[PDB]
Amino acid sequence: SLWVDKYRPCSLGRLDYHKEQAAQLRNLVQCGDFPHLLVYGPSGAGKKTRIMCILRELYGVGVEKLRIEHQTITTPSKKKIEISTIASNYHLEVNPSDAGNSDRVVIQEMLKTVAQSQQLETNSQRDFKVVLLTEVDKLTKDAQHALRRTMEKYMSTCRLILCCNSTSKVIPPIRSRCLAVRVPAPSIEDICHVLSTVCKKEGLNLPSQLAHRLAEKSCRNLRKALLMCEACRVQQYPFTADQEIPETDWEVYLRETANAIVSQQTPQRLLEVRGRLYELLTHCIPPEIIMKGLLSELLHNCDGQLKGEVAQMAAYYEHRLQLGSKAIYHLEAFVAKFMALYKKFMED
Template sequence: MSLWVDKYRPGSLGRLDFHREQAAQLRNLVQCGDFPHLLVYGPSGAGKKTRIMCLLRELYGAGVEKLRIEHQSITAPSKKKIEISTIASNYHLEVNPSDAGNNDRVVIQELLKTVAQSQQLETSTQRDFKVVLLTEVDKLTKDAQHALRRTMEKYMATCRLILCCNSVSKIIGPIQSRCLAVRVPAPSIEDICHVLSSVCKKEGLTLPPELAQRLAEKSGRNLRKALLMCESCRVQQYPFTADQDIPEMDWEVYLRETANAIVGQQTPQR
């Protein structure tokens, strides 16, 4: 049994619920043939990863959804072994290099080198390049970013990069200038209400418009968070009521209680 946020995730650009004009532009980008490096950025829960996966499906077909988790061991120049987990299909590789901490530069260089030098399995029906999806690139060290810039130039013929992050403010200019920037804005309150109502309808549930509005506002325009809260409300109480309590995330409750404890009594004994 999967969460609603995964169960109803759109699988193609044509099925996206909002920013449809942007989806049409991405489809045109795929069809034009000259596919560039991409820098996809926007707030959490805006749909960046969903759009990237839809774009990959447009590029390679359904085979891109046959994913496997791979654990790779990379040896740093200091002889230290770096363990990193990746998600891969026959056509793309997804990795978060910042998981390796200060060794992110080595991870980027070795993984991109391996992917760029490997051959496509179905060259007759597929593109002549593979895609590497790097997430949270705004958390990379400056050394890693400069290494990434050099690697982008070296393996452009056989490898395309899709960089995903929340903000471009921490990404060096040379990387930004080598990518086509795609900003994914947060969905509007109306967009989130529409998605929540649509998902509940597919589940055979009736969602009061007032509750949908409260969920959308409390989520901070984060669609993933809104769907998770809506599913929590379903577990807590159904039929829905317009004024029912919306459960908070456990980490939010913990942080608030911790902050209150710190503010409430600032003594050595505490």
């Protein structure tokens, strides 16, 4: 229990930002027939805590207890797949993107069991059970078609909550029937407010300069800000205005990878950069995150006309990375094309 979940708000009245949206979601809940929700926004914005607040407003306090169960579903290709699940008496939470192209093997089946439970469990509180869908943006085309037919079939049976970061990959049929809840990232002052409130509730005091530095370093990620504040608490018992905020280890590793890319353009350096990217990939860092970090740390050393070409190359190879399966090929292909272009730029 770190500071990120010990002080997570439990009801819609305890939220500190997006208060108008919180009141709108409360009015949504009080109508009694709230629709499928499509909650989206950047990572660390506060989508999950708002969904939890909605769930605590819908049902009683009993949603606050959770339990983990494992479900083994037989694929139509006759190869059983077992997935984990967080659940309660009133709601289910699932992430079928873990099932690969067999995500529909979750989608057409799992919620069906919940629908079965909706004719098995009777509570006389509400006529539905909320199914939370995490990382619905990572589903495939046929998985989303299965989800569409599923919410058509069990509309009056269960309600759907779809949490994502980007609604670009989701189909327009899946958006045409869900109420869209856009949760933007909190501002700097809002992160400072949350950090000061969380430090006061713990009994410590942090200066406004340190809170502003943490909020600026978090890149409008509230969870990253809370984790960095906890790390600063670990480093020093009192909070000083000049206390060094510690940096992320894989981020600084990516920074030295970019420095090694820039420094020398040789096949040997290309092989060490490939080894570094393999080391990052073995740490379960997503390759899209690696590409974004590499582009962010390579555009500092670039020149104005080179920046557009480098950004377009990074986008091209990241789309190739999405299409392919072995991401090291696309990562190092972007890397090697960048060293070739950078060398050609530096010779002239």
